[model samples]
Target: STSDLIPAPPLSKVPLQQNFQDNQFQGKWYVVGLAGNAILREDKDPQKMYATIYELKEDKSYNVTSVLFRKKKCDYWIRTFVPGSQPGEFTLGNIKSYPGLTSYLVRVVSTNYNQHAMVFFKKVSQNREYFKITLYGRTKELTSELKENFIRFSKSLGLPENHIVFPVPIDQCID
Candidate 1:
C-alpha cells in the first residue's frame, strides 16, 4: 500500500558535484544503510546480496547490479541508468520498478564519486512518496567525518534516525 511508504522531501536544484562521470566510481560498494520501506526480508537469503554500481562509459551513465538472496533462490538483476532531463529526475532502465510505476523519477539525494550515499525518489498521488537511500564506502568501516556527513544529510532531508538500517556483513568475497 502507498500508505506503507514514506514520502521524500522535495529536492532542490543541486549541481552534480561527484557522480558517475567522475571515473573514480568504478568499484565495489557494500550497502551500509538503507532508508524508507525498502527492507530486506528475513527470508531473503544473505548470500551475494550486495548491490553494485559500475561506470561504463563517459556519457554520465552507469550500470547497476544487485545480487540478492530470497527464500529459496538467489536473484541477480541489472539496470542501466539514464540521466534526467531536469536537475532532480533520473531514469533507471533495464530493471523492474519496485514502488514507482515507471523506472523514471526524481532523485531526492545523491552522493560523491565514492558511492557514500544515494537517495532516489518514488512518487505517489502527484507527490514524492518514498526514497531508497543507501550509504556505502569501499569498506564496512567509516570515518568520523563520513559518518557525521551521512547523518547530517539524512536528517537534513527529514528522514527519521531510526529508519536507517546498516548493512550486516554476510561474507568476505575477497580471499
Candidate 2:
C-alpha cells in the first residue's frame, strides 16, 4: 500500500512513559541536524539556528522562531503554532510578514516516545513538493553520528534515499 511507504506507527501502538497530553515540551532545542528532500549544509554555527519547544498554554498557542542567513545579512522568523484537530499538527506562520513565508499542509510523520524524537512533514501549498523537519532530544546538541542514525531510521521507514538531507555539523556557536 502507498501508505506503507512511510513507516509511521500509530501513536497508540507506541508505548508512552507518560501520556502525550501530560508531556510538557518546553525548552531550547539546538539544531543538531536536519534532513530533507534537498541537501542542507550545516550552519557554520549551530547555536545561531535552533528551535524552541513549548506546550500550548491555556489559550492553545505557542511560538517558534527560525534564524537563517541570507546574502551576509541575518534574517529571523517568528511564528505561532496553534493547536488544531490532531496531535503534533499545528498552525504555522509568523506574527509579522515574511516575504519568503510559504504555506503548506503539515503533518506529523513520526515520533519515538522513548527517545523523545519527532519528525514533521510539510508539503508545499498546492504543490507536490514536500519537506521534513526531524527534531531530536530536549536540548542536547545533534552530533554527526546521531544525524546518520536518524537518516538510517528514516530510510528504514521506506523514505527515498535521494530525498534525505544530512545535517552539517556546526563549526561555530552563535547565540
Candidate 3:
C-alpha cells in the first residue's frame, strides 16, 4: 500500500468556533477570498466570486449550494456538510465530481453568523489532497479586516502570499 501521500491537515492547527449554531450558520454567503495551496496548482486563473447557499437540516447537516459562472454560463454545485463534532467541526460530503473514495474535512474556524465566516477545508482522496481557507461574507464586497486576517492566517499555515486571492465579483447568479 502507498504511504499516505497527502499531508494530514491537523485539526488542532485551526480551532473550531466555540459555539456554532446550525441554524445561524444556514444562509446565503459570498466567497470573497480564498487562500490555499490549491490556488497555486488546481486554480491557475484569477478566481471568480461565487455565492454559497447553506440550508440546515433537522439532522444538523448542511446543504451547501454554490453558484458561479463558467464558460459564460451559470453553474451550480451542491454538496452536503456533515457535522463531525460540536462547536463547528464538519465534513463536506458528496463532492460529485470526484471518486466516492474522496472525503472533505471541514470546520468553521471563525464567524459572526450575520456578516462573516472563515472556513477551513481539506479534501483528501486516495493519494492526493487539497486544502483551502475561505473568507465568506454576507455581502459581495470583501471586508478589509477579514481579508487581512485571512492573509495572516494563510501565512501562518505556510501558504505562499501569491496563493491568496480576493476574487472578482459577479453580479449574476447571486439569487
Residue range 46-68, candidate 3, lDDT tens digits: 77888899998778888889999
Query: Residue 121 CA error for candidate 3 (Å)?
Result: 0.3
lDDT scores in order = 0.54, 0.48, 0.80
Residue-wise C-alpha lDDT for candidate 1, range 1-175, written one tens digit per residue: 3445544656563223333343565557666666554443243532232556555556766676665545445566676666677543467764355544443453525556553655454534333455556666666656768766666666666666666555555554310
TM of each candidate vs. truth: 0.67, 0.57, 0.87
lDDT of 3: 0.80
Show model 3 residue runs off by greater than 4 Å.
1-9, 41-45, 94-97
Clash pairs for candidate 3:
none
Locate the minimum summed-lDDT window of 10 residues in model 3.
1-10
Report the C-alpha lDDT of model 2 over 55-113, residue by residue, as the tens digit.
Answer: 44567665655545444665666667765546655656562354444654334444443
What is residue 143's positional error in candidate 1, in angstroms?
2.1
Q: Could you arrange the candidates by lDDT from highest to lowest?
A: 3, 1, 2
The total of clashing pairs for model 1 equals 3
Cα lDDT for residue 123, candidate 2: 43
